[PDB]
């Protein structure tokens, strides 16, 4: 399944940027849980703004507006 491609060393890199020294082996399968739910919650909104406008490709602006709605704004792709 495609979620297992968020590989163990990738979680370690993300964690290392965040500043943690030593990682329990239970954190790998638990962290995937929080990434999987976070993507679920912004893709619902991005596909909602898509279905509204009748087009059927998700644009960068759609994921920008979805992220903006939930208080997790990004400057980068179009404010």
């Amino acid at each position: 399944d495609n979620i297992q491609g968020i590989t163990k060393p990738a979680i370690r890199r993300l964690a290392r940027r965040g500043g943690v020294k030593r990682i329990s082996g239970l954190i790998y399968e638990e962290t995937r849980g929080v990434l999987k739910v976070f993507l679920e919650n912004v893709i619902r909104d991005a596909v909602t703004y898509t279905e509204h406008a009748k087009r059927k490709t998700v644009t960068a602006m759609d994921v920008v507006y979805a992220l903006k709605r939930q208080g997790r704004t990004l400057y980068g792709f179009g404010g």
């Binding site: 940027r17 500043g19 943690v20 020294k21 208080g71 997790r72 704004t73 990004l74 400057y75 980068g76 792709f77």
Partner: protein
């Protein structure tokens, strides 16, 4: 821009780029409050390491 005096010039590099603004907008602290609501794409994070993780 302006508070990038404290950054771009200090690294001896010309042309402001996204690893700056970050490494500034989240370092000066009258600001920060204006931009908390925003991540900077391609901006990374400021270095830290907490005082209990470094060797004693």
């Amino acid at each position: 821009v302006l508070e990038l005096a404290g950054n771009a010039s200090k690294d001896l590099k010309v042309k402001r780029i996204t690893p700056r603004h970050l490494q500034l907008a989240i370092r000066g602290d009258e600001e920060l409050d204006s931009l908390i609501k925003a991540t900077i794409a391609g901006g990374g994070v400021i270095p830290h390491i907490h005082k209990s993780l470094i060797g004693k």
